[PDB]
Write a protein that binds this ligand. Structure first.
Ligand code: EIC
Ligand code: K
Ligand code: K
Ligand code: NA
Ligand code: NA
Lengths: 579, 558
């Protein structure tokens, strides 16, 4: 397979690859990576739909894990996929079209990103406030990824850096903890460089009409069903037995339980197996208005399956680094709070400066309470987020970056709180008078459901050589790993739906010999215009000569500025507002 | 309107723009820019086809150029055009699959000495003259207004293989626009690895009319687009109201009769200003093409517009006082049997008769006095060719020099004489040349095109009108003499399509991005790669060293 960019390869359709009529696919896991794998097999490999088998764990607001993340314009592979998927909401258009038009009619932005002091906007909200710490980000970008394997974010950055607005925005919007992968943080800084101008106000974000299941999954299900793709339910895959001959690796048998019955699927080299290794949602537990979600570190089918594959070959990854020994401080709890009436509306509208009731964007993404002990953030998407909402209901999402600290108002770790308690802590930080908080958080007014997710932070655990298996392991004849614990050969970023679609595309194009380019990760880190733009924005719009940096670097900059005067390079710096 | 890049904007379909149902379009000129205007109007503006009027000068030449992968706008258009040759597929798909099955490359780019490959063929051979190219890219465009190529480069630069390759493949003459040469060097930086062997180039299956024009005509006719024939537009009368400019009347002769079309601000006029093919003449095997500098309908129309507003450009800059040395003559030689085939096959090392690429682009005879180049596309180039016919294209960069064998300037030569000069340079024994170039064996037809080099004349700000002039309510200029706001390069079909897209999206308020010029000049990987290939692959041209290597490896540069 090969990588490409530009419209010629984007718009081109591949020829049907040789041999595909003889082949079948077994997709283990029906999350976005698996569904996307089926799409590329149907559309591009031209595999017969009835030869594609999606093995699904499940059988044939308040729901917190039907929920998803924002996207951005440069999700190159994901948009390649969704332009071919009919919209369910807009008949006659693609899903891309629905989303593009929605984004044009109701563009995303935040009027208030950071609050403190029980409801005041942080006075420096909007500013990165990096000062000389910006140099640290530059130094990270200039440090090769192979030099920083296993290292954490806090091992690299200064104490000062973690006190900056930049770190607040970054850690909260991406869910980076200080003990997470430095290499992944570097990948994010490179990957999303083109959006440095749009991070504090979230103008860089785009969102679906509805919750992820409704908006992103249902159109895929409809498309796959329409092409005769086979869905197997109540499937619990215990293992994929892999044969070794020479340097070749061949999936030989799928071992599973389905409808309570032990089954095996015998495979040949023409049966292609795609494994979603690992899960960030598995083992989630649920509380309710009056009950905490039970704390657990149980492993389910996904983690066990990866363990069983890992035992068979050193190239099949190391699940333990992602699912074992996560710190107590990790993000675990997310909650949805349903406002049942309009009593609390003014406490949110005073922040967003927008009506909650007009169907358009509200918070524009998370608001973070910077002096909350939990590092509590909340967001209100455009509404309704669930089509089942009555017209008076508004659904608020609530999350805590720190799980080991007692709250400011409710003196408990978030992991020990009922839904009502989580709501009470929020209301406290919104400025609701304390005498009203108990009533305003009670069921007549709000219903709040917490979920404890042991592995929600797992994608970002520091990685060493071999921890993630290659999408197509060397010598693999008919076996791929897909999803956000697989190792794409690119520098793409995990905890994104783009990465799921990418691994699907790379797996299918590689194993089925699809003769069309896979888009490279969008090359903004190599675009001089974006490098210069980022240095302008990151410094809170200082000219390059005025930016705080160690004196030898400052001297180097002055010398260089003299070297390029009156040249095209100077025009590029002027265009970037750096001179 | 706005510029974009990436797949999100590429794949997105625009909403139907407000007010389009009350609007019509008048497209003056049916070259590629005009047809492309109509495609964007139908597909993206959703203007009714019956409200789109293409005014065609002809009642009722065929040859075009290569393309490359980063023709972003042109591929945006052709992915929506059904292929005529491969039913069920887009034209882009036809072309993409063909390019994969029969990829283009040249095994012989430069020849001399009556049929030897030049010994340094394949090398740029720039040496320190490479610095001059760097200097040019580092010179702001605003500093080189009106300058010519020969005003900037050293005598030594013009002796380099680089200049031979560049001048002949792009038809840059020494007195042409330096700014445009700079734009070509920046625009096509991503293909520096592929210029001497033409692996950068892609070609249609057939001649430009058959391959590029016919599918457009089918698409537009299928959508109800109106074609008006034998239209000779003499003027577009433009009113001025405050700062606004509004096309008010089209004045034209159609079918022997004078007519006027009255316009409102909802009738959108797209003018292809100027033409490189206008006033072309044809000779035959035994007759030179008649020589001329006549201005025709297109030049006269641009002049009549230029008179009405200083924002409407200055055609005289491009169409007057072209040097006698300019390229004027192209010829097609049809081989009627296989008697001459070895003289081409010895060069290409490929059979002429297997339907696959042959010369891969022009071969230039570096020691010919005319600077004669010739190409043999994949065959047949015309569907009407009999199986034993092979069509060869021939051009001369210099029109003011006597040939080496035929002692005449190309502009004074019959088809047969142009063939004889070619066969001389292929190493055919001179005693055999007259018979082998005779009609039983070769039939050669010369064309004289007075304006073929006009796109590249040195220009200043304002000489090309903006695609949508400031304050224009319903008038656009399209094609390769209009000024796109980008750094894009003329003498390309890509530029035609770009101006069409810019004009339509601007005047009709289409809310979708127009792809920016592909940004390879800003991609540091390409800056580094270009330095490597331009120097003929030179390296030459501690802990930190190791991190630099690791970074380069991380970016696949090593
Ligand atoms: C999001 C931040 C992006 C800002 C731009 C990033 C990088 C700019 C490009 C490289 C800077 C060139 C100087 C390299 C510094 C080397 C210092 C060192 O020897 O360690
Ligand atoms: K709103
Ligand atoms: K051939
Ligand atoms: Na930016
Ligand atoms: Na296509």
């Amino acid at each position: 397979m090969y990588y490409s960019n530009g419209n010629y390869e984007a718009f081109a359709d591949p020829k049907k690859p040789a041999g595909v009529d003889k082949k079948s696919a077994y997709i283990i896991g029906s999350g976005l990576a698996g569904l996307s794998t089926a799409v590329f097999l149907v559309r591009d490999a031209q595999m017969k739909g009835e030869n594609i088998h999606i093995l699904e764990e499940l059988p044939v607001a308040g729901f917190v894990v039907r929920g998803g993340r924002e996207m951005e314009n440069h999700f190159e592979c994901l948009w390649d996929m969704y332009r071919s998927i009919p919209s369910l909401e807009v008949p006659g258009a693609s899903y891309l079209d629905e989303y593009y038009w929605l984004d044009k009619e109701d563009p995303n932005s935040s009027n208030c990103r950071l609050i403190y002091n029980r409801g005041d906007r942080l006075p420096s909200d909007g500013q990165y406030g990096l000062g000389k710490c910006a140099n640290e980000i530059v130094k990270l970008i200039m440090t090769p990824e192979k030099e920083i394997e296993g290292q954490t974010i806090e091992e690299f950055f200064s104490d000062e850096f973690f006190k900056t607005n930049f770190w607040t925005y970054w850690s909260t919007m991406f869910a980076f903890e200080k003990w997470h992968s430095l290499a992944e943080m570097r990948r994010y800084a490179m990957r999303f460089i083109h959006h440095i101008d749009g991070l504090p106000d979230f103008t860089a974000l785009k969102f679906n009409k509805y919750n992820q299941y409704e908006s992103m999954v249902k159109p895929l299900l409809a498309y796959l069903k329409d092409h005769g793709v086979q869905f197997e339910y109540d499937c619990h895959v215990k293992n994929v037995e892999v044969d070794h001959e020479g340097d070749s690796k061949i999936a030989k048998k799928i071992v599973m339980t389905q409808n309570g019955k032990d089954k095996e699927i015998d495979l040949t080299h023409n049966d292609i197996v795609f494994v979603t290794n690992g899960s960030i949602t598995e083992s989630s537990t649920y509380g309710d208005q009056n009950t905490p979600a039970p704390i657990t570190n149980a492993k389910g089918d996904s983690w066990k399956l990866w363990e069983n594959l890992a035992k068979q070959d050193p190239a099949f990854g190391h699940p333990d680094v992602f699912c074992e020994n996560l710190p107590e401080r990790s993000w675990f709890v997310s909650a949805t709070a349903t406002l049942e009436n309009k009593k609390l509306a003014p406490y949110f509208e005073r922040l967003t400066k927008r009506s909650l009731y007009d169907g358009k964007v509200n918070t524009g993404g998370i608001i973070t309470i910077v002096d909350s002990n939990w590092e509590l953030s909340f967001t209100i998407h455009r509404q309704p987020h669930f089509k089942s909402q009555n017209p008076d209901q508004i659904v608020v999402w609530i999350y805590a970056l720190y799980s080991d600290t007692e709250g400011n108002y409710i003196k408990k770790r978030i992991v020990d709180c009922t839904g009502k308690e989580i709501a009470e802590e929020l209301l406290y930080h919104l400025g609701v008078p304390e005498s009203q908080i108990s009533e305003l958080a009670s069921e007549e007014n709000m219903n709040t459901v917490p979920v404890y997710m042991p592995y929600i932070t797992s994608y970002f655990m520091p990685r060493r050589d071999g921890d993630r298996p290659d999408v197509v392991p060397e010598g693999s004849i008919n076996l791929a790993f897909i999803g956000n614990f697989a190792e794409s050969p690119t520098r793409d970023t995990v905890f994104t739906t783009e990465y799921s679609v990418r691994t699907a595309m790379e797996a299918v194009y590689t194993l089925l010999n699809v003769d069309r380019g896979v888009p490279e990760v969008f090359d903004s880190i190599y675009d001089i215009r974006q490098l210069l733009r980022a240095m302008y924005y990151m410094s809170d719009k200082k000219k390059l000569a005025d930016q705080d940096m160690p004196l030898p670097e400052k001297l180097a900059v002055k010398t260089g500025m003299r070297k390029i005067k009156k040249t095209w390079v100077e025009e590029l710096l002027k265009e970037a507002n750096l001179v």
